[PDB]
Design an enzyme around this catalytic site. Structure first.
Site, mmCIF file in Angstrom:
data_model
loop_
_atom_site.group_PDB
_atom_site.id
_atom_site.type_symbol
_atom_site.label_atom_id
_atom_site.label_comp_id
_atom_site.label_asym_id
_atom_site.label_seq_id
_atom_site.Cartn_x
_atom_site.Cartn_y
_atom_site.Cartn_z
ATOM 1 N N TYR A 46 -1.676 7.392 19.393
ATOM 2 C CA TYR A 46 -0.707 8.709 20.000
ATOM 3 C C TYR A 46 -0.335 7.310 19.795
ATOM 4 C CZ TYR A 46 1.865 10.092 23.554
ATOM 5 O OH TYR A 46 2.630 10.016 24.700
ATOM 6 N N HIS A 93 -2.635 8.788 31.392
ATOM 7 C CA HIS A 93 -2.355 7.276 31.443
ATOM 8 C C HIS A 93 -1.740 6.861 32.654
ATOM 9 C CE1 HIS A 93 -4.193 4.977 28.277
ATOM 10 N NE2 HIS A 93 -4.754 5.853 28.413
#
Lengths: 286, 285
Positions: free
Chosen positions: B53, B106
């Site tokens: 990603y 995250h």
């Protein structure tokens, strides 16, 4: 510390160059935190020439590196970094808060007609000092310089082709001389091969080259002369290669490789391990 | 070869799962695609594509290569106002998949904007389950406490259930209370529990490095690689469903599979925890 002119570029660049080891991934904070101290150390100890391509991409890292470089004087450092490529240079120049980049070089079809012209325009504007290109295969470098306009490409950057284990760049040095192109070597250690710890887990080097380089590192260990010291000594040892770009995070590595390159090279040991690296000289793993 | 359940999510993950690793990223790429094929061949369903990603060219190659494998045969996870939903959409688009099995976050207040958005995407059926990723277990605890109930289904954490660090143990009772599945990562301490040793960038203090190197050469003299013991310990706990290792070549994946399928020498684990003394759980974050 020794300095070479980067071809017809006018920039006095140090024989070693700090490349700001890759920051992406998890634990990125640690790596960029250390890389800032490494930039400071390299500049304070002789390395004009910082490349920040691994910072090209990360907003926050690039910006606080802009802070760090704002801590340093105008002529104290030469900086280089990676249609809409114009806006990319502008964007990342803003993020670095520098007023002009000392050299821009293209990562990687016909870049000959789209990106390089825009960067030439940018060099005429005053915002970029000089133009260059980056690639893995020297035939590709020859191709793009050939089909470009005259004196468009001022610098080239290339990996793993002036080492104790790879010697290919010599074959092209003359060519670069003929078209006024400064040469930048990179990865002096073969990306693990000329390391005494060894080769990383991702490295696809064939078993033969791996074994030759491990035996050379062992012989270096037994001779009290680290193979990495010899490799970095050797990559900056060519007067026709202006500079070589090593990548590290900890400032201790910058200072160690500085201490290495400033120490006299043992040409007999070079002959010895260049022999021990046998049939695998210039064997490729790209 | 052994499978556990990721908390209450109902996904069956192997005790060891593959987290394909980080110029020179194309070579790593091709090797990693071959590695995910090898892992799915040998039973390592859980596949995290977080390092892809960010690069269109990089995520496209695994999307196109992974289209070649049956959907029910693997469980996929990736990294991530409501920009997070658009991120999930585009990740699926370049991966060419209609359903992501696990989606993580995250890293401050993702408890009221990001996590409700991902929950909404699960409500629609595009993602199956939602989790979080952090280096600090205190931060994971904060997120789980302050989020809406039953939102956090997965928690990924690095370098805290291994031979030198077991700070994950203290939080296991808590994670069981909350209904949270745990995904361990970096069973080697990113070079500490390796025979080769630590990368240059590693900040670990002198004492930790030396204790781990002594344990490593001890393991070598014993004919029992420190890496084997490391990965065996990391997957040895049943309250931790899966451990994620980030490799590039397929030979590393096969080595680790052969290692986890071998029994663990607990006497060796203790002789190694005696060499790693006051250095156990010493942080370098």
């Amino acid at each position: 510390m020794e300095y070479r002119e980067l071809g017809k570029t006018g920039l006095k660049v140090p024989v070693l160059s700090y490349g700001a080891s890759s920051l992406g991934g998890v634990f990125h904070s640690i790596k960029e935190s250390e890389a800032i101290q490494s930039v400071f150390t390299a500049v304070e100890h002789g390395l004009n020439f910082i490349d920040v391509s691994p910072y090209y991409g990360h907003y926050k890292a690039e910006t606080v590196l802009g802070k760090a470089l704002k801590e340093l004087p105008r002529e104290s450092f030469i900086l280089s970094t990676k249609k809409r490529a114009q806006e990319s240079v502008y964007e990342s120049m803003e993020r670095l808060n520098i007023d002009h980049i000392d050299l821009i070089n293209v990562h990687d079809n016909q870049v000959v007609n789209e990106t390089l012209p825009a960067l030439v325009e940018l060099k005429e504007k005053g915002l970029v000092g000089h133009v260059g290109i980056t690639d893995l295969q020297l035939e590709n470098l020859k191709w793009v310089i050939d089909h470009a306009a005259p004196d468009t490409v001022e610098a080239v950057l290339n990996f793993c082709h002036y080492s104790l284990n790879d010697d290919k760049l010599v074959d092209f040095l003359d060519y670069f001389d003929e078209k006024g192109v400064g040469v930048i070597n990179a990865s002096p250690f073969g990306m693990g091969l000329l390391t005494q710890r060894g080769v990383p887990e991702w490295h696809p080097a064939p078993k033969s080259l791996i074994e030759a380089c491990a035996k050379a590192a062992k012989f270096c260990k037994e001779q009290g002369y680290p193979i990495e010291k010899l490799a970095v000594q050797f990559s900056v040892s060519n007067p026709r290669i202006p500079t070589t770009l090593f990548s590290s995070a900890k400032s201790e590595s910058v200072l160690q490789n500085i201490k290495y390159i400033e120490e006299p090279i043992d040409w007999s040991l070079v002959e010895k391990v260049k022999e021990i690296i046998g049939d695998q000289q210039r064997v490729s793993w790209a």
